[PDB]
């Protein structure tokens, strides 16, 4: 009877950066995955494990909506078993993913003429992220053998770099907002239905 708050997840005025992707848990509400599929505005809507038309009746304990902003050419990396600077260092999806990935273009509201640098992606990390890991640490990356001692210098780089978002970039470089829904079951009762 209580529509799940998918609006504010997909209607948010300020999306989080990919390195600080925002996870909103959804529980104790009735979610209709019918305005979400037939919206006719989503560039990408790819469901892993559960069919898009059949999950409208599958009942789940929790539904995690993970939202962030990436580039267009990097949407393919939000998928199981993908290697890339976002799959490896910013946001990793499990190989046995049982959710959906939604993505839509955002040159509007997110591509200021002067350049929107509020969004950062991680260039470097010591090791690849385990599935669903959030690393918001800004420690200097030591590429060389000389310890950095916390100062930015040669072979000592800041992991986070700003996306270059301009109103003239090619579709590959234009900003895409991405929401990854993780539908999970546990021994707890299924509080998510439709």
């Amino acid at each position: 009877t209580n529509l799940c708050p998918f609006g504010e997840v997909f209607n948010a005025t300020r999306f989080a950066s990919v390195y600080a992707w925002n996870r909103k848990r959804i529980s104790n509400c009735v979610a209709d995955y019918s305005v979400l599929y037939n919206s006719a505005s989503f560039s990408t809507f790819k469901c892993y494990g559960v069919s898009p038309t059949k999950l409208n009746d599958l009942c789940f304990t929790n539904v995690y909506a993970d939202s962030f902003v990436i580039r267009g050419d990097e949407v393919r990396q939000i998928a199981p078993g993908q290697t890339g600077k976002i799959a490896d260092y910013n946001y990793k999806l499990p190989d046995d993913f049982t959710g959906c990935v939604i993505a839509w273009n955002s040159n509007n509201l997110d591509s200021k003429v002067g350049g929107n640098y509020n969004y950062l992606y991680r260039l470097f990390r010591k090791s690849n992220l385990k599935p669903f890991e959030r690393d918001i640490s800004t420690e200097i990356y030591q590429a060389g053998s000389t310890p950095c001692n916390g100062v930015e210098g040669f072979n000592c780089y800041f992991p986070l770099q700003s996306y270059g978002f301009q109103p003239t970039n090619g579709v590959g470089y234009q900003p895409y907002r991405v929401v990854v829904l993780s539908f999970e079951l546990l021994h707890a009762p299924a509080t998510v239905c439709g």
Partner: antibody
Amino acid sequence: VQLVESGGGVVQPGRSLRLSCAASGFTFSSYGMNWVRQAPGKGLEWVAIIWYDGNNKYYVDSVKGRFTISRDNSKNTLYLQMNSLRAEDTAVYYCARKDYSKTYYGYYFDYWGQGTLVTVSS
Amino acid sequence: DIQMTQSPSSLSASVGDRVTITCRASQSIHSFLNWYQQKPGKPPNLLIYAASSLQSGLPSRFSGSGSGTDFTLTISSLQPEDFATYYCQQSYITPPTFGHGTKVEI
């Protein structure tokens, strides 16, 4: 944008030399600068880098401890003080500009000079 | 530092042929490979930076492609002015190491 080198020549082994590079056509105190040497019939070999702040200088092995890269931003000149020269430093030395990137990990040499030959064998 | 191997060391090609020069890194350098062109007895000229970006003003025939360890410079139409030595350089870790170079013959 021009980068003209000078100071090369024949120098006896174990002696010293100072290569200069005069730059024109752009603001000097905004670009990192580089020295890259090419031995005859061999590929390019990066020699040294000086950052635009005048404090961060990096050298390649076999050059560290001998060569000193510096810049006089007030004169629009880049120096390379080559001390204790060996026989293996015969090469043409180019002063290469570093892009306007501000980042330590993605730079390229957009504008090169013309090259000055520094023969060392006695 | 990172060792760079450029293959082939020398290539024979005719006008209008396809040329492909591969630069391989001992360690991952991400997308921080640059390609320079040097004709004999002349200063090197920048062709590619970031492994995919063509320096402004240069002919569009040149292209780059690669990520991590393997990189490729492709010349679609080898014109008479494209016969020179091509070097690959990594900017991921200072020192920036140049490849030993690939010369293009007739």
